[PDB]
Amino acid sequence: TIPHLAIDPFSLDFFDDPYPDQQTLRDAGPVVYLDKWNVYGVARYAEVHAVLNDPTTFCSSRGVGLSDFKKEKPWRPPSLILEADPPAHTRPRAVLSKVLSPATMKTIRDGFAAAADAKVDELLQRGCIDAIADLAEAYPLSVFPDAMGLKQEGREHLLPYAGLVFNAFGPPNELRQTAIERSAPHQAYVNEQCQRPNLAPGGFGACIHAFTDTGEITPDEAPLLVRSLLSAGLDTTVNGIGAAVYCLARFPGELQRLRSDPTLARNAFEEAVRFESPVQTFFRTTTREVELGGAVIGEGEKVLMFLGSANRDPRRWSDPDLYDITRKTSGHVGFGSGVHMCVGQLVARLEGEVMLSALARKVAAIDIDGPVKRRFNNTLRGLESLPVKLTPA
């Protein structure tokens, strides 16, 4: 009843151009079986959304990578938020919600916006730049480590650590094995910075530790919650901002609409998250036998959710393969959905909005003018290099 497919959604050929295979995954049925990895796959919008909103059956506490924590040892201690189900999830989630709250955004917005404006002006003085190294990476590196309260020493480990984290949710392919092997120096740096003495008062990390006084988290939970922000809060934004710039470079008509109304910046960023889906996939594990789209899945099975596919499903989206900065984006699953929906979404949107606002006000054209290179990761979609010429407004 369930179709069996040989598509490897973690192969380099798939990463290089996933769209035909994602349509094959959607059109084969609401649920497929991926023989390459012995997992179920769910690629249409409706079923992806339903699974994400059914946490008592499609759980996170057995891991959201391929590995099942009831069968294998996790490569690092489990995340107290990502890899937990309610009720254990709830209080750690509340702490990160408050640390990354609407009220907190007020305290960082001026500096985040000023840094974005300055970066765009700096890049305009160069003209021809690499929108990854010089923009998508440089901007978050200039604001997020400081907002976390990290010391200066060791920050070179942050992007390597995040790449490792995101590769490690994948299957045990070469990308994963290479990432985990000799990763101890990156782990040691991150784990050290999670300790309270290393985090500047007033930053996100110190604020997490301050919540240990309230009874929401114990002192020994705080370092792992700092670890969550250092795992999930940098490389995601690099790929989100890179996605938005790549969209504006390829759709000049949409750049022109953004220039004419810079208040579209926030939705232009949200649409880039839908369109590229910088976080492509994650897993759940069934806690019981369950029917999904007519297919019966046994207990203890891994289920792979294709967020990028759901975000392009023609059953749900008109003109899904068009980047449209005025699209009604609500309901896209690029930040997930339900109880685990990205707790950092306000930080992500703040960074994306202020960068696109700076581009909207300062740049007249974005032209690809060198070889584009894709970056491969088991979970993240994005570019390694994006040479562009920026023309000033």
Ligand X SMILES: O=C(O)c1ccc(C(=O)c2ccccc2)cc1
Residue 165 interface partner, choices ligand X, Cl ion, ligand HEM, none, CB cut-off 5-8 Å depending on type: ligand X
Residues at the site binding ligand X, with contacts judged by CB under 6 A = 64, 79, 81-82, 165, 169, 227-228, 231-232, 236, 279, 282, 379
User: Does 207 show up as a binding residue in the annotation?
Assistant: no
How near is the Cβ of 381 to ligand HEM at its closest, in Å?
Answer: 10
- Measured from the CB atom, the residue of 2 and 164 that comes closer to ligand HEM is 164
CA distance 377 to 379: 5
SS3 101: coil
Annotated ligand binding at 340? The verdict is yes
Burial of 372 (0-12, 13-18, 19+ CB in 10 A): middle
| DSSP designation for 331 | T
Q: Does 80 bind ligand HEM (CB under 6 A)?
A: no
Q: Please say which residue, 248 or 307, places its beta carbon nearer to ligand X.
A: 307
CA–CA distance, 325 with 258 (Å, rounded to integer): 8
- For 18, residues 6+ apart whose C-beta sits below 8 A from its C-beta are 9, 280, 308, 309, 381
89 is in an annotated binding site: yes
- How many residues of this chain bind ligand HEM (CB under 6 A)? 27
Using CB distances below 5 to 8 A depending on partner kind, what does residue 379 bind out of ligand HEM, Cl ion, ligand X, none? Answer: ligand X
Q: What is the CA angle 390-392-393, rounded to 5?
A: 135
Dist CA 361 CA 358 (whole Å): 5
What does the per-residue mask of binding to Cl ion show for 188-207, with x meaning CB under 5 A? --x-----------------
Tokens of 222: 């705080």
93 annotated to bind ligand: yes
Q: Is 157 within any annotated ligand binding site?
A: no
Smallest gap, in angstroms, from Cβ of residue 26 to ligand X?
Answer: 20
C-alpha dist (Å) from residue 314 to 23, 46, 165, 366 = 9, 11, 31, 29
Q: Is 347 in the site for ligand HEM (CB under 6 A)?
A: yes
Cα–Cα distance between 319 and 339 in angstroms, integer? Answer: 29
Site for ligand HEM (CB under 6 A): which residue of 162, 226, 229, 264?
A: 229
Distance between CA atoms of residues 282 and 305, nearest Å: 6
Q: Which residues are annotated as a binding site for heme b?
A: 89, 93, 284, 340, 342
Q: Which residues are annotated as a binding site?
A: 89, 93, 284, 340, 342
Q: Which residues bind ligand HEM (CB under 6 A)?
A: 60, 64, 81-82, 93, 96, 100, 228-229, 232-233, 236-237, 240, 273, 278-279, 282, 334-336, 340, 342-344, 347-348
